[PDB]
């Protein structure tokens, strides 16, 4: 089927056409019509297969048909485990809702708490949330959520993996259960996922699998490269890498969209043409840019991990992981196949700092081969002085530098591997030096019962609001 | 009047009603006391008396009314300050289980 063949509103149908999407994939075809009819549906789909558009289309159609307004409430709520997936959902909902009058917004950890509370008070009709920040806003921030008509859980297996089982239990309890459609997705089904599906769904749902069981696994010959580099010279090694490894194919993975958009615009002033791919650009521009890179013979592509793990990566010479990956297990098994695949000889490299030596022990316990790279310090294009002058002189690149630096620590802070990527270990002065700052911008790094009060007893009754 | 009765009693000043009620236990530990006689007043008219063993014991809350103090010149009686009294209780104090707790306090 096609999106035009599906009966939708004129504004949503013409918004999909502006995105350039005409065909409809597996998870879109057999999850959207049951969602529009009203039935609650759970599915097991790999991310990047189009399932983000699968839960957004019934959400927008519900809000538009019921004629929602900012004074009405929150409408649809989407729950998302990490920050960088929530900005992609916000990015695609901005393109999908550009012809409607409803409001969309994002509440994530590590952002401004007071600014989010002001957004929620004014009224956002489609909310994309991280479970930690959503619980704090529902308990404390006064905003309307009595008109909740749909609840969507995205990457459920990742939410329980982070450790948000307690918060998701409290989220379902607070939210109104009557006359709302719930729609949760998880690639892998566990007992905790079935427990979450039991307390969130209403009797018997329809269950979908698109996921492929036959997955290629690693061997003892899959070489993974790593380079040890200090925190103040991470970009300088990358810039020295790309400027001589040009007239080749290079892909670099980043941790945030702000980190992508800062380095994409930074590399226009220091003379290095690099193609970019982030969520602030339109969807038609994103697929056109990847089509140019797929058909190119040589060039550089910059994107995030979670944008790359949905896309099909061609045969390239090097895959660069500049920042820590969101799922290190899925990182090695996938990009190991991506470099070693096909007749081409591709090599996968991951940037390491001296404080992340625990990854090598994790690497050796998994019995996957490593390759260290020497990195002579003479062959460095010392453009730090030119970069530092230009950031402090150009205001727009100054703003992009703070937004990239702020999003880098926040993605570092939300990391699953606390032991390997610890935020209280890396020097904040050195990280801001790589971003182009003499002094670090102000970022909050944080964002068992003992010695009770004498004679105190647990609470027995009372009305607390 | 009641503090003059108790030689083992220490008088204590105004307690914040905006505090927590179990901070009385931290208060009585400071003055090294195992009993608290709390005079709690509401609306500037009513009186509530609390009797409690301090770390763990029971606690009873009364409503005190019909107060007539020693300074009223119709009593004609006087006694030594700090003398050991004879406690006269009632038969109902030994029958009802809640009155048995009040009697020990």
């Amino acid at each position: 089927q096609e999106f035009s063949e599906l009966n939708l509103s004129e504004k949503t149908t013409k918004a999909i056409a502006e995105m350039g999407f005409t065909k409809m994939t597996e998870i879109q075809r057999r999850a959207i019509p049951p969602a529009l009819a009203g039935k609650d549906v759970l599915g097991a789909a790999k991310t990047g297969s189009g399932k983000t558009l699968a839960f957004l289309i019934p959400a927008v159609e519900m809000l538009s048909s019921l004629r929602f307004k900012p004074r009405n409430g929150t409408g649809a709520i989407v729950v998302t485990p990490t920050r960088e997936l929530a900005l992609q959902i916000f990015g695609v909902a901005r393109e999908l809702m550009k012809y409607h009058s409803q409001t969309y917004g994002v509440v994530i950890g590590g952002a401004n708490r007071r600014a989010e509370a002001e957004k929620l008070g004014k009224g956002v009709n489609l909310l994309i949330a991280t479970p930690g920040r959503l619980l704090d806003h529902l308990q404390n921030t006064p905003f309307v959520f009595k008109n909740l008509k749909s609840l969507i859980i995205d990457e459920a297996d990742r939410i329980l993996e982070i450790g948000f089982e307690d918060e998701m239990r409290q989220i379902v309890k607070i939210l109104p259960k009557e006359d709302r459609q719930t729609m949760l997705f998880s690639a892998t089904q566990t007992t905790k996922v079935e427990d979450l599906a039991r307390i969130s769904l209403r009797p018997g749902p329809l269950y979908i699998n698109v996921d492929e069981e036959k997955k290629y696994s690693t061997v003892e010959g899959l070489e993974q490269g790593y380079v040890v580099v200090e925190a103040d010279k991470r970009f300088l090694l990358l810039f020295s890498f790309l400027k001589k490894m040009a007239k080749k194919k290079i892909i670099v993975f980043f941790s945030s969209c702000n980190s992508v958009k800062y380095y994409s615009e930074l590399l226009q002033y220091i003379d290095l043409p690099v193609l970019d791919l982030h969520g602030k650009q339109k969807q038609q521009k994103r697929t056109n840019t990847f089509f140019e890179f797929c058909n190119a013979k040589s060039g550089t592509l910059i994107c995030t991990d979670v944008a790359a793990r949905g896309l099909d990566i061609p045969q390239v010479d090097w895959i660069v992981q500049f920042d820590p990956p969101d799922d290190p297990r899925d990182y090695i098994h996938r990009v190991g196949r991506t470099a070693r695949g096909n007749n081409g000889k591709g090599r996968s490299l991951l940037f390491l700092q001296p404080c992340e030596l625990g990854f090598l022990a994790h690497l050796k316990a998994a019995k996957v081969p490593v390759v260290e790279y020497d990195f002579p310090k003479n062959k460095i294009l010392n453009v730090q002085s030119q970069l530092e002058k230009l950031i402090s002189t150009n205001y727009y690149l100054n703003q992009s530098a703070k937004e990239g630096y702020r999003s880098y620590i926040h993605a570092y802070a939300s990391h699953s591997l606390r032991s390997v990527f610890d935020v209280h270990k890396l020097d904040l002065v050195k990280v801001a030096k790589s971003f182009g700052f003499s002094t670090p911008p102000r970022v909050d790094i944080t964002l068992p019962q003992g010695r009770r009060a004498y004679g105190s007893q647990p609470r027995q009754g009372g009305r607390y609001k | 009047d009641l503090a003059s009765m108790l030689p083992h009693g220490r008088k204590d000043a105004k307690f914040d009603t905006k505090s927590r009620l179990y901070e009385l236990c931290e208060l009585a530990e400071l003055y090294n006391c195992n009993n608290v006689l709390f005079f709690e007043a509401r609306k500037g008219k009513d009186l509530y008396m609390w009797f409690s063993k301090v770390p763990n014991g029971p606690t009873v809350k009364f409503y005190a009314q019909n107060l007539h103090t020693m300074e009223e010149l119709h009593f004609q009686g006087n006694c030594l300050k700090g003398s050991r009294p004879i406690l006269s209780f009632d038969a109902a104090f030994e029958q009802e289980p809640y009155l048995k707790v009040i009697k020990e306090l």
Partner: peptide, 29 residues
């Protein structure tokens, strides 16, 4: 001694815990 391959390693009281009359957590000091 990292047991599972790519996940995190597993991880003065002035009171005693007893039971109250309604089956709660009574603290004895």
């Amino acid at each position: 001694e990292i047991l599972e391959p790519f996940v995190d390693p597993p991880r003065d009281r002035n009171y005693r815990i007893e039971k109250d009359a309604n089956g709660g957590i009574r603290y004895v000091y």
